[model samples]
Target: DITVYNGQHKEAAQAVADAFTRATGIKVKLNSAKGDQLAGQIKEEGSRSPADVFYSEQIPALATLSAANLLEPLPASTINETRGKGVPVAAKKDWVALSGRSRVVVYDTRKLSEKDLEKSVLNYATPKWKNRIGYVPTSGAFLEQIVAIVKLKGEAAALKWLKGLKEYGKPYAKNSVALQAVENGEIDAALINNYYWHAFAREKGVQNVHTRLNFVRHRDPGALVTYSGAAVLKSSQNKDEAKKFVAFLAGKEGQRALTAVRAEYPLNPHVVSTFNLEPIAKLEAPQVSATTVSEKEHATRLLEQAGMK
Candidate 1:
C-alpha cells in the first residue's frame, strides 16, 4: 500500500502513478494540491501525516521536510545509483532527486541572435540586457538554484548576481509569463526552466518563430539544474512499502515513467536522457551538497533583496 502526496504537475504525477501500478501491481493512491498548499499540508500533518511518501516538484519543499526531520533516510543503494556525481547531491540520504530540469534563457530570435545572447545568466544584469530580459525570482525553484550559487560562488558574488538581475530585469509573476514576454518580443530573453518551455512548445506546436528555446550550458550561472525529489515520511506506517516504492521509482521503470509522461530528464545515470541534454561533465554548477541547500535561508533573503516578495 502506497499513499503518494503529489504537489502540482498533475499530468506527470498521475502518469507516474498509473504506470507504476500497472507495472508493479502496487496500488499507488494519490492526493494532489497546489505546490504551496501541499507543502503546508505536509507540515501540518507533521509526524501524524497519513502520507507514506512525499513527491515534490521542487527541492525547497523536500528540503523543508528534511529540515523538520520528517523524512526518513533513503536507501544507500538508491543514493549511489541515482545521485549525479560532480553535480550537487543531497546533504543526507533523506531524499533523492527523481528528475531534474535545466535553467535556460528563452529568447526571441527576431530580437536577438543566438550569438548576441549573454553567455552566463549573471550577464543579464549588465547594461546590454537592461529591460531586455524578464525573470521570476520569487519561485522556490529559482531561489533554490540561487542558494546553490551562493554556496558555489561565495556570498559576495552570488549577491552581486542577484543585485544585477534585479536592477536590469523585469520581474514577472510566473515563469510562463516570462516565457511569453520573450516570445512576444517584449523582452529579448528570460530565465526559465527548460521543461516548461518544452512543454509549451510541444503543446502549441513548434512551428512558431518564437518557440525556439536555447539552453545556456557551459557552466554558466543561468544553466543551474533544479531537481524534483521523493522521500518516505518518518511517520509513515508503511515504511517497508514506501522504501520499495522509492527504489522502484529510482530504477529503470520509474525513470521511464518520468520521461514518457513528463518529458523531464531522469535522475538515474543508468537511464539515458531522451532529450539532447548537455553533458553533466561540462556543466560548471556549484559544489554544494543538496542537504546543505536544504538548510539555507538564502531564498528568503534573495527574494527580498530583489523586491520580488
Candidate 2:
C-alpha cells in the first residue's frame, strides 16, 4: 500500500490514482491540502512523515522540501522515462511536473485590449491600474506568482510590487470572485492562472464575455509557466512504488487524467491542451530554476505584511 499527499483538486487526484492503481495494481492511499500547507506538513513531520509520495500545485513547496533535504531525487531512468516532450518540465529534475499552467493577466476586454495590457507583469503594479484591478491576495496562484517574481527580479522589487498590489489593487477572497467581479464589470482586469478563467468564460458565454487570457512571452516573469509536481520522500520505505507513482503522473496516464478534470495543459508534450490554450513548450516561459527560486516563504510573509490575510 502506497500513501500519497495530493494538492491537485480532490476529484482529479482520485482519478489519476485510480488509473495508476488499475494499471500497476499498486494500491494508493491519498490525502489533500494546498501546496504550501502540504509542504509545511511534510516539513513539520520530518522523517516521521507518513507520506510515501507528495504532489503539489507549485514548485516552491517542493523546492522548500528539497532545500530541507526531505526529498529523494528521481532516479535517472524514471526521470528520462517521464521527460516532457514540448511541455514544461521541472526546473531541476528532482520532481516530476505532471501537468502545467501559466500565470496570465485575465482582463475585461471592455476596457483593456491585448495591447493595452502591459508587456510586463510589473507594469500592472503601476498607477494606471490603480484600484482598477482585482486579485485574490492569499491564493496559492498569487503567492506562487509573487514567489517567481522574487526569484526573477529581487526582494526589493518584489516588495515594491506587493506594495502596489495592495495600494493599487482590490483584494478579492477567491479567484472565482475576482473573475466574477470582472464578469459583472466591477473590475477591468486581474492577474489569474490561465486555467481559472475558462469555466467563468463558458458560463458567461464566451461569444460576448468581457474577460480573456493574456500571456506574456519573451521569458518575462509574466509568462512564468508552472506545474503540478509529484515527488517521493527520502524517508519512505516504498521507494520503488513511489517512483512508479510519480513517473506515471509525469507520463501520459497522469497527464490525461488531470487534463480531463482541470482545464490545465498537459505536461506531457504529446498530449494536446483543451480550450484552445497554447501548448506548454511553445509558451517560452521564463527559465527560473526551482532550485534557485528562493524567498517563497519570505514573499508570503511579505504578503501578510502588505495588507493581505
Candidate 3:
C-alpha cells in the first residue's frame, strides 16, 4: 500500500487515487490536508514519514520538502519521456508538475475595461486602486505570488505594494468570496486564479455572471503561471509504484483526469486546456525559478514584517 499526502482538493485527489488503483492495482492511502500544513507535517516527520507520495496544490510545498532532502530524485527518463522534460515544475528534478493554473485579474466589466487594468500587478499599489482591489491574504497561491514579486521585482517592490494593500485593499478569507465580491460590484477587481472565474460562471449559469478574467500582457507578475505538483518520498519502499503514479499524472490520461476533476491546465504539452480561456503558450509570464518561489526565508519574513504573518 502506498500512502499519499494529498494537498490538492479532496475531489481531485480522490479521483487520481481511484484512477491509479484501476490502472495499476496498487492500493493508495490518501491523507488529504491543506498545502502548507501537510508540508510542515512531512518536514517534521522527516525520514520517518510514512508518506510515499506528496501531491501538492501549490508548487512551493513540494519545493519546501525537496529542500529538506525528503524526496527521491525522480527518474530522468520518466520525465524526459514527457513533453519538454516533463514540463518540469521544480527547478530541480526531484519533482515534476501534475497540472497548472495562471494568475489573472477578475474585474467587473461594468466598472473597468481591459485598458484600465495595469500591465503590472504592482501598479495596483497606487491610490488609483484604493479600496478597489481584492485578494485573499491567507492563500498559499497568493503567498507564492508575493514570493515571485520579491524574487523578480525585489523585496522593496513587493512590500511597497503590499503596504498600500493593507490600508486600501479589501481582504477576503477565500477566493470564491472575493470573486463574488467583484461580480456584485463591491469592488472593481480582484486577483484570482483563472479557473475560479470559469467554475463560478458555470455554477451560476453563464449569462448571469458579472465578472470576466483580465490577462496581463508583457510577462507581468499578474500574469504569472504556477502548477500543482507531485513527488516521490525518499522513505518510500514503493519507489517503482510511486514513480509510476507520478508519470501517470504527466501523461495524457492523467492530464485529462486532472482537467476533468480539477479544472486546471494539464501540464502535458500534448494536451490542450478544456476551458475556453486563452492558450497557455500565449501568456507572457515572467521567468522565476520554482526553487526561489519555494524558499520561505525572505518572502515569508517580509510578509510578516508587513503584518501578513
Candidate 4:
C-alpha cells in the first residue's frame, strides 16, 4: 500500500490510482489538494512526511520538492519508458512527467486570420495587440511561461514583455473565461494551455467551436510546454511501493486511464490522447528546464512590478 499527495485534477488522479491498485493489488490512499498546498504540506513534514508519492499538475511544485531534497530519483528504466516522442524529459530526473500540455493562442476565427497573428508570441505584447489579448497572470502555467521567458531572454526582456502585456492585455480571472471571451468575440485571442481547447472542442464538436488554436513556431517562449509530473518522496517508508506506483503511472496503463479522464496529452510513448490534439512532435516548444521554471519567486515579483498581479 502507498499514500499519494494528489495535486492533479481529482478525477484523473483517482482513475490512475484505481487502475494501479487493480493491476498491482497495492492499495492507495489519496490526499487531495492544490499542488502548491501539497508541496507545502510535504515540506513541513520533511523526512517524516507520510506521503510516498507526489503527483502534481505542474513541474514547479515537483521542482519545489526537488530543490528542498524532499524527493527521490526514479530508476533509469522507469524514466526511459515514460519518455514520450519529441517531448523533452525533466533534467533533474527526480520527477517523471505523466502528461503534457502546450501553451497556445486561442483566437476567434471571424476576427483573426492566420496572417493577422504574429509569428512570435512575444509580439502580442506590443501596441498592435492592445486590448485584444486575454491573459491570467496568476495562473501557474502562465507563471511557468514567465519563468521560461526570464530564463530564455533576460529578466529585463521578460519584464518589458509583462509591462507591455499589462498595458495592452485584458486581464481575466481564469483561462476558461478568457477562452470564452474569445469565442464570444469580446477579445480576439487568449493565451492558455491547450487542454481547455481540446476539452471544449470535444464537448461542442470541432466544427461548432468558433475559435481555433494557434501553436507558435520557432521555439518561442509562448510555445513553452509544461507537464504534470510525479515524484517519490524521500520520506517514504514504502519506497519500493512508491517506486512501483510512479513507474505504473508513467507506464501505458496509467497513461491510458489518466488521459481518458482528462484532456492532457499522454506522456507514455505507447499511449495517445483520445482528444484531437496537435501532435507533441509538431510543437516547437522552447527548451526550458523544470529547475529553472521552478524558481518562480523572481517571476512573480516581476509580474507585480509590471502591474500584472
Worst 10 residues of 3 by lDDT: 80-89
TM for candidate 4 is 0.90
- Can you write out model 2's per-residue Cα lDDT over 1-309, one digit (the tens) per residue? 799998878877888899898898999998888877888999989988888999887666787787788888886765664465444354556776676778887887877787787888887787898988878888766876777787888877777888898889888988888887887888888888787787666556788777888888878878887767788999898988998898888777677776766777775667664467677767778877663334557777888777786
Deviation from native of the Cα of residue 185 in model 1, angstroms: 2.0
| Tens digit of per-residue lDDT, candidate 3, span 56-160 | 887778877888888888777655534442255455788877776888889998878887888788887778888999988787668778888877888888888
State each model's CA lDDT, in order.
0.74, 0.78, 0.79, 0.85
**lDDT by residue for model 4 (1-309), tens:** 999999888888899999998998999999999988999999999988999999998777887788898889899988887675545565678888778788899999997888889887888899998999989998978888788888899888899989999999888999999999999999999999888888888889888999989988578898888878899998999999999999998888888888886888776768777776555656767788764533688888999999977
Clashes in model 4: which pairs? none
> Which residue pairs does candidate 3 place in steric collision?
219-284
Candidate 3: where are CA atoms >4 Å away?
A: 43-48, 81-92, 291-297, 300-309
TM-score of 2: 0.82
Give all TM-scores, in the order shown: 0.84, 0.82, 0.86, 0.90
CA lDDT, candidate 3, residue 278: 56
Off by over 4 Å in 4: 84-93, 291-295
